[PDB]
Amino acid sequence: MNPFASLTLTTLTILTIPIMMSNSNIYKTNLYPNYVKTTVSYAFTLSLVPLLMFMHTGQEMIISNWHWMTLQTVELSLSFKMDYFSVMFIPVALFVTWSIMEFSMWYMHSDPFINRFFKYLLLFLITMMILVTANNLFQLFIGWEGVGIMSFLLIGWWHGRTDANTAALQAILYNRIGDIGFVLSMAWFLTHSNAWDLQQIFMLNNECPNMPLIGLLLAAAGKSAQFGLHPWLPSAMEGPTPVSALLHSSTMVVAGVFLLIRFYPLMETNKLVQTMTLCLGAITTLFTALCAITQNDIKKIVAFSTSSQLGLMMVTIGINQPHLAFLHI
Amino acid sequence: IRWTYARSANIYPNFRPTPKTSLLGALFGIGPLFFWYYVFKTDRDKKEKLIQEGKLDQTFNISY
Amino acid sequence: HVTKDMFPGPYPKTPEERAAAAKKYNMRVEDYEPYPDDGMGYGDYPKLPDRSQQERDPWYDWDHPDLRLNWGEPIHWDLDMYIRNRVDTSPTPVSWNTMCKHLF
Amino acid sequence: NVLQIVRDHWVHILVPVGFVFGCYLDRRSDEKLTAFRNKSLLFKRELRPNEEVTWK
Amino acid sequence: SSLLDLIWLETILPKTTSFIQMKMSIMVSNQKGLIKLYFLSFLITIMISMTLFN
Amino acid sequence: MLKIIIPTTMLLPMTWMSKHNMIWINATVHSLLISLISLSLLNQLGENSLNFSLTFFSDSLSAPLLVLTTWLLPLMLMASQSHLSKETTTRKKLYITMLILLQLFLIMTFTATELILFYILFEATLVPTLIIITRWGNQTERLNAGLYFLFYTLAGSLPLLVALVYIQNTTGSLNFLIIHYWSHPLSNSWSNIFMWLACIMAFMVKMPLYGLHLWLPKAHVEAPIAGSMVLAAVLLKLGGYGMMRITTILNPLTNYMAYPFLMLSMWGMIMTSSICLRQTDLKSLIAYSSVSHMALVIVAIMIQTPWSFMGATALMIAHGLTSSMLFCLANTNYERVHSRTMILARGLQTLLPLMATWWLVASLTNLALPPSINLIGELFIITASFSWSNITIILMGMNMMITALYSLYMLITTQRGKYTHHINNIKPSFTRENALMALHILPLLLLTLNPKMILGPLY
Amino acid sequence: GSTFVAYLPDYRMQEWARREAERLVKYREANGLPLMESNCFDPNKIQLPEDED
Amino acid sequence: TMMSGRPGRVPLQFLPNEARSLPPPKLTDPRLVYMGFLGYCSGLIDNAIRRRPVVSAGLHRQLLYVTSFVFFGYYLLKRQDYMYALRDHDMFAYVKSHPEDFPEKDKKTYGEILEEFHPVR
Amino acid sequence: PDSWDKDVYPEPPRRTPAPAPQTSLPNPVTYLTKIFDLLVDRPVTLAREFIEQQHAKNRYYYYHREFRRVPDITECEEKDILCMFEAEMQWRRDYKVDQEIVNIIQERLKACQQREGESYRQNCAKELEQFTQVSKAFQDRYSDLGAHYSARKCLAKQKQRMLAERKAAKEAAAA
Numbered sequence A: 001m002n003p004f005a006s007l008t009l010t011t012l013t014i015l016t017i018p019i020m021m022s023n024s025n026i027y028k029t030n031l032y033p034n035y036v037k038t039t040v041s042y043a044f045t046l047s048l049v050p051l052l053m054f055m056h057t058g059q060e061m062i063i064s065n066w067h068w069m070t071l072q073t074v075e076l077s078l079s080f081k082m083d084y085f086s087v088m089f090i091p092v093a094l095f096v097t098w099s100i101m102e103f104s105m106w107y108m109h110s111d112p113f114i115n116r117f118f119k120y121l122l123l124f125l126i127t128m129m130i131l132v133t134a135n136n137l138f139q140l141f142i143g144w145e146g147v148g149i150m151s152f153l154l155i156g157w158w159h160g161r162t163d164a165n166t167a168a169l170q171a172i173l174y175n176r177i178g179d180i181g182f183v184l185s186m187a188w189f190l191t192h193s194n195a196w197d198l199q200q201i202f203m204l205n206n207e208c209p210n211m212p213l214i215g216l217l218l219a220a221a222g223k224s225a226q227f228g229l230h231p232w233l234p235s236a237m238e239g240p241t242p243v244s245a246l247l248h249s250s251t252m253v254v255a256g257v258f259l260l261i262r263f264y265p266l267m268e269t270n271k272l273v274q275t276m277t278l279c280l281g282a283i284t285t286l287f288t289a290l291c292a293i294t295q296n297d298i299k300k301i302v303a304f305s306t307s308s309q310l311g312l313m314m315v316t317i318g319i320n321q322p323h324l325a326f327l328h329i
Numbered sequence B: 001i002r003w004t005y006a007r008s009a010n011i012y013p014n015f016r017p018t019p020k021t022s023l024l025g026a027l028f029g030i031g032p033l034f035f036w037y038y039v040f041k042t043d044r045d046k047k048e049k050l051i052q053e054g055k056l057d058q059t060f061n062i063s064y
Numbered sequence C: 001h002v003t004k005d006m007f008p009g010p011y012p013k014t015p016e017e018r019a020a021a022a023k024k025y026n027m028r029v030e031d032y033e034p035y036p037d038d039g040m041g042y043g044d045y046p047k048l049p050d051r052s053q054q055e056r057d058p059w060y061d062w063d064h065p066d067l068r069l070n071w072g073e074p075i076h077w078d079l080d081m082y083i084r085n086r087v088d089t090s091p092t093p094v095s096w097n098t099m100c101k102h103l104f
Numbered sequence D: 001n002v003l004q005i006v007r008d009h010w011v012h013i014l015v016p017v018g019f020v021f022g023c024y025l026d027r028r029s030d031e032k033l034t035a036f037r038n039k040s041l042l043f044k045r046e047l048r049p050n051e052e053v054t055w056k
Numbered sequence E: 001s002s003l004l005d006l007i008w009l010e011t012i013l014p015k016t017t018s019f020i021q022m023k024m025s026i027m028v029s030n031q032k033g034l035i036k037l038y039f040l041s042f043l044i045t046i047m048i049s050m051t052l053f054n
Numbered sequence F: 001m002l003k004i005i006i007p008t009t010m011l012l013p014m015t016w017m018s019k020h021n022m023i024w025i026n027a028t029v030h031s032l033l034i035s036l037i038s039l040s041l042l043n044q045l046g047e048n049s050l051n052f053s054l055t056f057f058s059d060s061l062s063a064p065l066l067v068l069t070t071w072l073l074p075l076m077l078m079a080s081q082s083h084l085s086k087e088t089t090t091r092k093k094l095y096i097t098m099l100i101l102l103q104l105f106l107i108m109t110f111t112a113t114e115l116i117l118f119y120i121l122f123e124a125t126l127v128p129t130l131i132i133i134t135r136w137g138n139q140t141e142r143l144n145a146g147l148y149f150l151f152y153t154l155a156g157s158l159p160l161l162v163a164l165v166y167i168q169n170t171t172g173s174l175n176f177l178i179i180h181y182w183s184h185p186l187s188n189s190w191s192n193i194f195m196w197l198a199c200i201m202a203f204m205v206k207m208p209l210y211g212l213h214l215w216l217p218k219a220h221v222e223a224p225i226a227g228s229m230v231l232a233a234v235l236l237k238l239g240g241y242g243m244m245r246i247t248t249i250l251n252p253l254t255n256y257m258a259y260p261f262l263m264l265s266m267w268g269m270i271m272t273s274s275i276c277l278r279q280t281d282l283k284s285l286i287a288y289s290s291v292s293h294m295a296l297v298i299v300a301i302m303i304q305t306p307w308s309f310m311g312a313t314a315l316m317i318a319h320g321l322t323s324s325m326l327f328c329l330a331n332t333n334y335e336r337v338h339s340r341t342m343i344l345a346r347g348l349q350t351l352l353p354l355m356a357t358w359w360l361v362a363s364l365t366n367l368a369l370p371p372s373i374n375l376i377g378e379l380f381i382i383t384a385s386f387s388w389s390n391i392t393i394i395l396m397g398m399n400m401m402i403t404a405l406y407s408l409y410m411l412i413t414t415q416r417g418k419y420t421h422h423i424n425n426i427k428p429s430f431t432r433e434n435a436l437m438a439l440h441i442l443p444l445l446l447l448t449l450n451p452k453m454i455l456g457p458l459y
Numbered sequence G: 001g002s003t004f005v006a007y008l009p010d011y012r013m014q015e016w017a018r019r020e021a022e023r024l025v026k027y028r029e030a031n032g033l034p035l036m037e038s039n040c041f042d043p044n045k046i047q048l049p050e051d052e053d
Numbered sequence H: 001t002m003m004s005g006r007p008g009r010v011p012l013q014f015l016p017n018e019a020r021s022l023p024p025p026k027l028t029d030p031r032l033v034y035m036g037f038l039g040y041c042s043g044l045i046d047n048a049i050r051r052r053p054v055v056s057a058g059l060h061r062q063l064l065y066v067t068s069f070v071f072f073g074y075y076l077l078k079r080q081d082y083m084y085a086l087r088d089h090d091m092f093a094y095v096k097s098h099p100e101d102f103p104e105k106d107k108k109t110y111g112e113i114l115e116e117f118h119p120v121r
Numbered sequence I: 001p002d003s004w005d006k007d008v009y010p011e012p013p014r015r016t017p018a019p020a021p022q023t024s025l026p027n028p029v030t031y032l033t034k035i036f037d038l039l040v041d042r043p044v045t046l047a048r049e050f051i052e053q054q055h056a057k058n059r060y061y062y063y064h065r066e067f068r069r070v071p072d073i074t075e076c077e078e079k080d081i082l083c084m085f086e087a088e089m090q091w092r093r094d095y096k097v098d099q100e101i102v103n104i105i106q107e108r109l110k111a112c113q114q115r116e117g118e119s120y121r122q123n124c125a126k127e128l129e130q131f132t133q134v135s136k137a138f139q140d141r142y143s144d145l146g147a148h149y150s151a152r153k154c155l156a157k158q159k160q161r162m163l164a165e166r167k168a169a170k171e172a173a174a175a
């Protein structure tokens, strides 16, 4: 069949081989971090191919490969959406992770558990790739919760430090506050649209009501650290600097914004939720920049800069410009 | 040992039915139940009246 | 190894049993003060200052350095609420009312 | 050594013998509920040239 | 934890039952062994049975 | 169905004629074999049921519970091997006899085509558990716990019996099949209201309902490890199974009568989740978490929709496995420290790393991390509740947040931080304990691959 | 046991149900029938009670 | 059902002659097996109380317990079956002789019976 | 492929544009897909040929089970349990077949939405109306029976709807 389909699934699959070999002999040696870095680089150069195919013709696919349980008229399956957002974000995230791992082999050299650090970095990358390419709400929730657990484990990397554990539990708390809205959105979409699949949700909602979009907005605010739920992102600087650079800077924290990007056909039909998104983004970017301009910890300054950029992304979503928000990501 | 015992097993022998204790117990243990009952009963009465009137628009509502 | 007389008892009414209770908790009779005798099951247990464990001296050599506690000292009733992982009561550079007003 | 470990390992055989006895008892109890065999409206079938009962 | 679970939910079902049964047992079993009182009670219940069930 | 019942009965002569040093090996081997045999009841039908005989029948609600019940006995034997080592041979054999009798009663309870037979076995389970708690418990409160655990149950179960016989005098049968096929609406009357209450309260007290949940922390804190395992894994699910079975004759009165129980459950799940936040005892914390999960199951059964029933089945199985694992981990800590207080032994990740991994996985599955079957049941119940009323989402979301909070609090308090200095008797974890944790956790992650096996008869 | 459960035969009749639905849809699409019907039972075999009020 | 005064009942007769018209219980009847099991348990408890090796102290005594329990159980099962047969015989005869009290109800199908529908919402 | 019916799962003719290169500069997509063919498609096809010929050496069949029609719950006496059992089982089988029909129509809808790209709102109206009709019918049949549903409850719901419809029609005729 078409090559484009095979390449997209191979990238994600070969991202998981070092996790399988985590019980092998190579995990007991000092060559494991280099093995993980090489795997990520190969995945990046392999994922460059579907990007070229899309840039040439614009190839788009849905791959529903495995049928998981069926619930009367509701069918749940392992389905991947390989649209422009996925095929554009995957190479960028892989490139950033490759650079971060190469930096970590120098930064975390004296750490006794450096293989576990790389294993952890790879697990976060896998969960984020699950989040980005999900075609239904259950799979997207799987990625949503996986990135949260990985951030909890990586913030509290030094578990003998009280403040690290406090920060990890803080991140979990705020993300559960957002998860309330995520679960509300899932319940509404199943009860009214009879699906968690994206195609049926788009088809059956020509004029989306307030409640599902407000749940989506609450989830996005929780996971992108908007004004009501902001402090966990600066508090997350307790983890090692590579963790701050990969998760809480450029890949995981944009997830909430990405969610609002993923549902943009429904968002454009509602003026109230658009206005709420715009106002939340504006207050977030202002408040976090205002906090930033007076800080003395350098990592805190960069974290507040990240939060302001996320607020700007929310403003762009609120003015009904999702592709520009993706480009900013 | 004293801390855990005081927190767990010494409470009831030192309990005394007092106006403060009685009012706080009644409030915190009954008021939320009746508040939530009123809220849910009102919500479901409105939904039932709407569905009898036919103006609910339950299209595509297959799973319950 | 703890005897029957080493457990919390009822609210002390007389100075003699007040002194006995203060002795039980390894603290001075003057410093001892029970919770007010209401229907709540506090009984005979010291009402220690409501300070958090974050306010304890971090340079003192505690027997439990992370919790900042010594072995035999009496334990605050709400210790698990003040454990440096949770709510703390440490003084701030700005007053609580001023911060509330400005944030609001 | 035979006739010595038997006196010591005889207990192990009981669980499997109980299972076989239970299977036989299940079949025996099944044999008394054949009032409608080949008589339901759904599976009323003509017997094969060398078939006596549709199920056992 | 303390007000509802350790005190009032305990007071309502189990503690009240224990108290009621304890008092009823102490009342019923406490007879000084004086057959005078026993047979006086017998006369009272005999007359009540005669005046109540017919 | 006798192919499972007879080997369980043969477990007793095999136990009592075993050598003094061969009881655990033989019991474990043959219990595992019985579990393997019982695993072939999972082949269910989309039609009625597996009606073996006039006395026993199988269902896709019954089969997962039966498989879990069989699988629990070997784990209970492994967990009990340690603290019963200094015990006489006769008393060890008596303990194993109690465990086997409890399994036999549970297996016959879950099939039990008759409601009176179900009631008789449902109450027969009460005796071995009571003996186990009051005989092989460590503290002086065990007796008191047993008393509570007894009378609460009977307080609900004697009215049910009366109602049961009453029903047979009017219907003429108590067979589940005839009861289901010949069901007639229940009028809105005082007599019918009290019949409804008599039918419900027996199963409601055993879940337990939030108001009637006081016996559970006592019984769990006081019982030995195997007693806690069977109480949290199987005995709490008898109420859910009974309610799902019996609510077929209670319509349409359930619509009105369910409101007080729905409010009690939806508020008490918040209450018990918050109670877990301030708890100085591991076993007590795990017991309160169990109360919260069973409150959610009660909401599911009272709503009485297909998604509610599927979620209730999934959540019952998942909670059984997870709570048994949590009790086993706490018991491994207790057998070293002898304290059972959470704040005492700290920083155990540095001293026991693999057991810290087991703790992490158990906390993640108690937290309902997708795609675990815990979250499958949670989400199905939440969706059904949202359809019932859109305002339930507030209480469900609060419960999820508080659940994550106390699960990670329990993990961080015991595993993270600095080790307690004066505790120097912490030995490396045994192969028996690691294997016990693995045998708890691998079945959960395997069940998430085939969820329809635990989604019940409405799948 | 996991392998045995994985390969349990389709006694819940999911494949059978999908094949029945496929052939039923094929027939109804071709014959112009309105796919699924609103009445689950044939109205001609139901005797309703006259109200005459 | 008080059959104490039932006509033609010989006063102290355990099994009447007409009970011979009924099929006897099989020797492998599950109830007979349970009575034998009860006798076996009695033998085990007898050994235990007298402080003897419980399983292998007196084989003659245990055999006698099992045999006596089986004997009495056989006769008890016969009497039980006979009494239930009498109950059914009397009930059927009474229904036959009182046709006006047990009428033949009209056959109605569900397609012509109106049952109230109560939606679950 | 023959593995499924083209009528139950219809597809458009799938018109594909032809490459019209405006420049002589070599593109990477064609060369890269050529090496992909050479390195992946060819060995996979060889392995499939081997597996298929091994399968063809051993050919055996399975059958789709046929269920005849039984009297339904409307033809069953009030307490006759045998016909009630037969009717209940038949009704349950029909219920599952209806679920699968709804699933087929939903699959059609999802495939149309993905296939039509930015024009899905206009070019998938037929599938939307099909799903609207089938969803309306399924909701009429089974929406509010709840757990412990039965053929008797479905019949009672249908009868209630029929009384409402007859009353409305008599009112309209006499209005």
Ligand SMILES: CCCCCCCCCCCCCCCCCC(=O)OC[C@H](COP(=O)([O-])OCC(O)COP(=O)([O-])OC[C@@H](COC(=O)CCCCCCCCCCCCCCCCC)OC(=O)CCCCCCCCCCCCCCCCC)OC(=O)CCCCCCCCCCCCCCCCC
Residues within 6 Å of the ligand: D014, D017, F009, F013, F016, F017, F090, F091, F094, F097, F101, F104, F127, F128, F131, F135, H041, H042, H044, H045, H048, H052, H053, H054, H055
């Ligand atoms: C659901 C129905 C199905 C199941 C049926 C269950 C009932 C059946 C049996 C009923 C009673 C009969 C036996 C009881 C006599 C007691 C004798 C005794 O003490 O045991 C010692 C004796 C061996 O010890 P020993 O050296 O001879 O002398 C030690 C002294 O006896 C004394 O030893 P010690 O002085 O060194 O130790 C003192 C100990 C001694 O105290 C005891 O041993 C207690 C005895 C049990 C009480 C019996 C009560 C009457 C029946 C009640 C049944 C209740 C069921 C309803 C559910 C409620 C659950 C409680 O007392 C204590 O430690 C006090 C603390 C105990 C904790 C609280 C008490 C709870 C007891 C509840 C037990 C209930 C089940 C008992 C099962 C049988 C146990 C042997 O054990 C045995 O060997 C007898 C077991 C039966 C032998 C089976 C042989 C057949 C195998 C080959 C044939 C294969 C069959 C298939 C054929 C086809 C294959 C090819």
Ligand SMILES: CCCCCCCCCCCCCCCCC[C@@H](O)O[C@H](CO[C@H](O)CCCCCCCCCCCCCCC)COP(=O)(O)OCC[N+](C)(C)C
Residues within 6 Å of the ligand: F188, F189, F190, F193, F209, F210, F211, F212, F257, F260, F261
């Ligand atoms: C303690 C821990 C938890 C334990 C379990 C608690 C759950 C049990 C709660 C019982 C459920 C409700 C009981 C009856 C519900 C019916 C509705 C009725 O009560 O309300 C009105 C009834 O009006 C009044 O309520 C009459 C009853 C008043 C007397 C009851 C005492 C009120 C407080 C006592 C609570 C104590 C509960 C525990 C007892 C040990 C309705 O008005 P009406 O249209 O006329 O009646 C319709 C019903 N009909 C047709 C059958 C007649």
Ligand SMILES: CCCCCCCCCCCCCCCCC[C@@H](O)O[C@H](CO[C@H](O)CCCCCCCCCCCCCCC)COP(=O)(O)OCC[N+](C)(C)C
Residues within 6 Å of the ligand: A019, A020, A021, A022, A023, F035, F039, F064, F067, F068, F071, F317, F443, F446, F447, F449, F450, F454, G001, G002, G003, G005, G006, G007, G008
């Ligand atoms: C250390 C790191 C690991 C190293 C090793 C690397 C390799 C890892 C790969 C394994 C995990 C990745 C997941 C991939 C899943 C592949 C297997 C899956 O596809 O099979 C599932 C099958 O799994 C089983 O269905 C679920 C497991 C059964 C659970 C039973 C528990 C065992 C009994 C013990 C008692 C427990 C009591 C619990 C109470 C209920 C689903 O199959 P299905 O699509 O459907 O159809 C099967 C084929 N058909 C079509 C012919 C029928």
Ligand SMILES: CCCCCCCCCCCCCCCCC[C@@H](O)O[C@H](CO[C@H](O)CCCCCCCCCCCCCCC)COP(=O)(O)OCC[N+](C)(C)C
Residues within 6 Å of the ligand: H004, H010, H011, H012, H013, H014, H072, H076
């Ligand atoms: C409690 C457990 C059972 C213990 C019973 C004692 C066991 C030893 C007894 C040995 C056998 C006794 C039978 C006597 C021989 C002949 C008796 C016969 O002549 O009398 C008949 C009477 O037969 C006996 O009544 C039947 C005895 C059978 C008792 C066993 C039933 C127990 C209920 C089931 C529980 C399980 C127990 C089984 C294990 C032992 C006719 O009596 P009749 O003059 O016309 O009416 C007077 C009595 N009325 C007024 C009540 C009607």
